[model samples]
Target: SMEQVAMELRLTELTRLLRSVLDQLQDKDPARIFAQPVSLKEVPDYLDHIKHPMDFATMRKRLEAQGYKNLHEFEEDFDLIIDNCMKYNARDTVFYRAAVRLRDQGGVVLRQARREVDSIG
Candidate 1:
């Protein structure tokens, strides 16, 4: 159960970060659905997408190529996924660990996107 507890904490950390980003993206808009995600909420399904990202690098490159011009859809979709993460069971260490991997890789993508945008005119 220690592993489970640790994973839950870690996953909770990532969820908190994601929620924070959502808040930033929404700018306190009530329309935003990513307010927060409870650690005891179906986190595995969302993790699957990250585990096998859709053309991960390619898609990210395409988005970065846009330089933050418009990420409405992408942002909305990610918020929904985070919502699903809220439905995840808190005790699922397997799922939590998997989410950690997804979160790590996602951090890379997000960082790259930011860099690409900053490099733009």
Candidate 2:
């Protein structure tokens, strides 16, 4: 249950960031059944896209190649992907992956901070 303040803040930032991403994409599909997910409300539904592994992998790869060092870096462009997914009613999958991506990335930062704290302590 314990977590670092920085990590939690980063996660909060991720949630806020994704909300904006979904907001922009919403204009493309106001008919979408899923409203924009707020913090801790069906979060994984908004951030973790597990159904389409290949597409997710490809998207990640492309983002990395495009100099996206963090989820926030590509947050703006995410609307396009969200829009595309919406067209197919597959928004859940992409949004889920976004959550997983943040978790994995934040996990790395958490691990590094733990080591730093241990050495300092």
Candidate 3:
């Protein structure tokens, strides 16, 4: 049906936008600390503090699997990655600072994407 075609078009566009945003965040973190899940052995108390852990790799997998029903869910996972870092690391630590940077950069990227979509619309 025409409605289904429109829905598919929207999904394809959203996925493209999501990938662009995710790529920017991944590229910003050269150290790749947030690229994968935290190691329990390395940070034993990680799970104790952050109830929901998030990372770029997991987000990518979720994106590929269409785990996110909408953009907000993807945004939540993105925020979770940063939030978890800040929660687990002290303000003075590199991990905390990295998260802060990612938060700021991610904000800019998201806003830019939104603006682009609005312009197209």
Measured by lDDT, the strongest candidate is 3
- What are the RMSD figures for all models against the true structure? 17.0, 14.6, 1.8
Model 3 Cα shift for residue 2 (angstroms): 3.9
lDDT tens per residue, model 3, 6-74: 887777777777788889888888888799999888889878898999999999998877676666788
Sorted on TM-score, highest at the top, how do the candidates line up?
A: 3, 1, 2
Q: What local distance difference test score does each model get? A: 0.42, 0.42, 0.85
Residue 86 CA error for candidate 2 (Å)? 10
Determine which window of 10 residues in candidate 1 has minimal summed lDDT. Answer: 51-60
Give the clashing pairs for model 2.
47-95, 47-96, 47-99, 48-95, 48-96, 48-97, 49-93, 49-96, 49-97
lDDT of 2: 0.42
Native RMSD of candidate 1 (Å) = 17.0
- Write the residue-wise lDDT of candidate 1 on 16-73 in tens digits: 4444453444343233223333222444455543432222233334344432233344
Quote each prediction's TM-score: 0.34, 0.28, 0.87
Better of 2 and 3 by TM-score: 3
